[PDB]
Design a protein around this motif. Structure first.
Motif, PDB file in Angstrom:
ATOM      1  N   UNK A  84     -35.776  46.064   2.308  1.00 52.54           N
ATOM      2  CA  UNK A  84     -36.463  46.546   1.156  1.00 52.54           C
ATOM      3  C   UNK A  84     -36.222  45.611  -0.022  1.00 52.54           C
ATOM      4  N   UNK A  85     -34.953  45.225  -0.213  1.00 52.00           N
ATOM      5  CA  UNK A  85     -34.644  44.426  -1.427  1.00 52.00           C
ATOM      6  C   UNK A  85     -35.195  43.032  -1.244  1.00 52.00           C
ATOM      7  N   UNK A 117     -36.227  56.595   0.776  1.00 47.52           N
ATOM      8  CA  UNK A 117     -37.075  56.542  -0.412  1.00 47.52           C
ATOM      9  C   UNK A 117     -36.219  56.688  -1.682  1.00 47.52           C
ATOM     10  N   UNK A 118     -35.341  57.707  -1.738  1.00 44.85           N
ATOM     11  CA  UNK A 118     -34.558  57.925  -2.900  1.00 44.85           C
ATOM     12  C   UNK A 118     -33.654  56.706  -3.198  1.00 44.85           C
ATOM     13  N   UNK A 119     -33.071  56.116  -2.160  1.00 51.01           N
ATOM     14  CA  UNK A 119     -32.097  54.988  -2.285  1.00 51.01           C
ATOM     15  C   UNK A 119     -32.782  53.732  -2.825  1.00 51.01           C
ATOM     16  N   UNK A 120     -33.994  53.451  -2.321  1.00 55.03           N
ATOM     17  CA  UNK A 120     -34.700  52.258  -2.699  1.00 55.03           C
ATOM     18  C   UNK A 120     -35.155  52.399  -4.156  1.00 55.03           C
ATOM     19  N   UNK A 121     -35.756  53.560  -4.482  1.00 49.94           N
ATOM     20  CA  UNK A 121     -36.084  53.882  -5.825  1.00 49.94           C
ATOM     21  C   UNK A 121     -34.887  53.708  -6.774  1.00 49.94           C
ATOM     22  N   UNK A 122     -33.734  54.309  -6.446  1.00 47.99           N
ATOM     23  CA  UNK A 122     -32.564  54.299  -7.313  1.00 47.99           C
ATOM     24  C   UNK A 122     -32.094  52.870  -7.558  1.00 47.99           C
ATOM     25  N   UNK A 123     -32.039  52.059  -6.501  1.00 48.13           N
ATOM     26  CA  UNK A 123     -31.583  50.694  -6.658  1.00 48.13           C
ATOM     27  C   UNK A 123     -32.608  49.901  -7.506  1.00 48.13           C
ATOM     28  N   UNK A 124     -33.882  50.111  -7.211  1.00 48.09           N
ATOM     29  CA  UNK A 124     -34.918  49.410  -7.950  1.00 48.09           C
ATOM     30  C   UNK A 124     -34.882  49.734  -9.459  1.00 48.09           C
ATOM     31  N   UNK A 153     -23.523  46.717  -4.661  1.00 48.44           N
ATOM     32  CA  UNK A 153     -24.324  46.205  -5.787  1.00 48.44           C
ATOM     33  C   UNK A 153     -24.100  47.079  -7.010  1.00 48.44           C
ATOM     34  N   UNK A 154     -24.144  48.408  -6.876  1.00 47.38           N
ATOM     35  CA  UNK A 154     -23.920  49.244  -8.022  1.00 47.38           C
ATOM     36  C   UNK A 154     -22.549  48.945  -8.660  1.00 47.38           C
ATOM     37  N   UNK A 155     -21.487  48.916  -7.862  1.00 44.96           N
ATOM     38  CA  UNK A 155     -20.143  48.699  -8.373  1.00 44.96           C
ATOM     39  C   UNK A 155     -20.023  47.341  -9.066  1.00 44.96           C
TER      40      UNK A 155
END
Ligand SMILES: Cn1c2c(c(=S)n(C)c1=O)N[C@H](SCCN1CCOCC1)N2
Length: 500
Positions: free
Chosen positions: A420-421, A445-452, A493-495
């Motif tokens: 996705x990324x 869907x939720x994960x890709x949205x959140x990261x994006x 990535x978030x951290x």
């Protein structure tokens, strides 16, 4: 509740609304055009150019079954005459069709099994359907096949490795060619090119094959009953220079992501991704039945790409404009079923092409899961997707959104979240928005949205994100001693960004 997140799909660019004014259609050194452009009119069957059949029998063109150079041992005889004699016989039983096809394929009389064909005709079809098959549909198919020299008058160049070239041909010309492929008439095709003759469709026990057959006969019934009037373009695209990903200063583009819908139905007018094999079409004429094979069955004009498209190298793709949808379906692999005939409602552009653009980009097969995190492998996928998305000489305003999904996941062992990324970065580099279908996986869907939205709100560039991918590889994957790493990509990535 929420079935989709991000930018509303309504706000994404689609053809024909976003489209450029097309230049006038004309043959050039990099564009083969096989019809009379001066006679091209909406609603009218295109007239072949040239008027009379011309033949090329060499290593740069399709070898046509009607060539005078297609010979068989008798002294040499004309195999095209043999073909006409064999196929111009009444069929009333599946053995009759097997025997016809084998007359001009004698070397294969013990190798080619026709069990799936026999089972289809005898054990799957209703008796009335079997009767319509052999009284109407097969004879109509023979006739369009034998009409090849009057239809396909212009030699067809192979789309060979490293060529940047386009073929624009009529949907009628394709029908003729595919009827020939069904009857296994293409000479010398039984090594860097996909299979084109349909013999592997007829073979084996398989419950997929009847469904494949039904899908293709649905196409054959339509195009032999009434000629399609439009054109189709096939473009091999091969880039020499690729972005310096770590230096790329471009922002991320918009994202719509949903666990409902399909690329083909919900991505109308968008650049639709084919999760391709490097042999375009994959297992369509044999055993395969997942995303690529399905798309090649419901839009069978894609299958003719196999006649002329050499295996894709790492920097290449195939872009197909104007294929028409003829069937609807349900399920995939073992549950795939032909539903019904589809009336394609797509508008046509100024070249009489359906406003449907499909790109074949083949992902890598990762036998070991961590292998895809190796920079060289990330870059490979980025550049494949980038080549598939880029339209040199077109402004971004005129580019539709990319309609894609879990590219290279399934049998190929891709990580959905990594891929996705990757596709998000490639799209961003090519200055296109992304519409992403997760195919029932609401958590994805939720994960890709959140990261994006996380990366967008923090204004990271393509290069920023790519560097984070490299950090993930260097800290968590490279000296990793287990099948998977300690920490998953998105959390890492978030951290890492939240740590700055
Ligand atoms: C029509 N269609 C569609 C798929 C997707 S992911 N999307 C977005 C889609 O629109 N998969 C399929 S069949 C193969 C299933 N595997 C699921 C995991 O990924 C690899 C393949 N058909």
């Amino acid at each position: 509740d929420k079935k989709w997140l991000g930018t509303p799909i309504e706000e994404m660019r689609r053809m024909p609304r976003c489209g450029i004014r097309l230049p006038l259609l004309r043959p050039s050194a990099n564009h083969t055009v096989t019809i009379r452009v001066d006679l091209l009119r909406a609603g009218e069957v295109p007239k072949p150019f040239p008027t009379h059949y011309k033949d090329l029998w060499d290593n740069k063109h399709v070898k046509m079954p009607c060539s005078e150079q297609n010979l068989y041992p008798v002294t040499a005889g004309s195999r095209w005459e043999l073909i006409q004699t064999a196929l111009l016989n009444k069929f009333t039983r599946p053995q009759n069709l097997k025997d016809a096809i084998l007359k001009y394929n004698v070397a294969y009389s013990k190798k080619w099994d026709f069990t799936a064909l026999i089972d289809f005709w005898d054990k799957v079809l209703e008796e009335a359907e079997a009767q319509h098959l052999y009284q109407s549909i097969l004879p109509d198919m023979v006739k369009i096949a034998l009409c090849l020299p009057n239809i396909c008058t212009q030699p067809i160049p192979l789309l060979a490795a490293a060529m940047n070239h386009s073929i624009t041909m009529s949907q009628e010309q394709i029908a003729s060619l595919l009827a020939n492929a069904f009857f296994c008439t293409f000479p010398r095709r039984n090594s860097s090119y996909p299979d084109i003759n349909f013999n592997r469709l007829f073979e084996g026990r398989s419950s997929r094959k009847p469904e494949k057959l039904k899908t293709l006969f649905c196409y054959f019934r339509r195009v032999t009953a009434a000629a399609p009037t439009g054109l189709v373009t096939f473009t091999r695209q091969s880039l020499e220079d690729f972005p310096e990903w770590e230096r790329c200063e471009k922002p991320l583009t918009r994202l719509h992501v949903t666990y409902e819908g399909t690329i083909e139905e919900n991505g109308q007018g968008m650049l639709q991704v084919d999760f391709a094999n490097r042999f375009v079409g994959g297992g369509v004429t044999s055993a395969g039945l997942v995303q690529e094979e399905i798309r090649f069955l419901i839009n069978p004009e894609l299958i003719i790409s196999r006649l002329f498209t050499e295996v894709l190298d790492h920097n290449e793709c195939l872009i197909i404009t104007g294929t028409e949808q003829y069937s609807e379906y349900t399920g995939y692999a073992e549950t795939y079923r032909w539903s019904r005939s589809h009336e394609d409602g797509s508008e046509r552009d100024d070249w009489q092409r359906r406003c449907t653009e499909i790109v074949a980009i083949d992902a890598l097969h990762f036998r070991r899961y961590l292998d895809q995190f190796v920079p060289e492998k990330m870059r490979r996928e980025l550049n494949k997707a980038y080549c598939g998305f880029l339209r040199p000489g077109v402004s971004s305003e005129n580019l539709s959104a990319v309609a894609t999904g879990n590219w290279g996941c399934g049998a190929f062992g891709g990580d959905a979240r990594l891929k996705a990324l990757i596709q998000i970065l490639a799209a961003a580099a090519a200055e296109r928005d992304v519409v992403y279908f997760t195919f029932g996986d609401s958590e994805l869907m939720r994960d890709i949205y959140s990261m994006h939205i996380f990366l967008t709100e923090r204004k990271l560039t393509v290069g920023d994100v790519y560097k984070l991918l490299l950090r993930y590889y260097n800290e968590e994957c490279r000296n990793c001693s287990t099948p998977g790493p300690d920490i998953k990509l998105y959390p890492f990535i978030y951290h890492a960004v939240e740590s700055c």
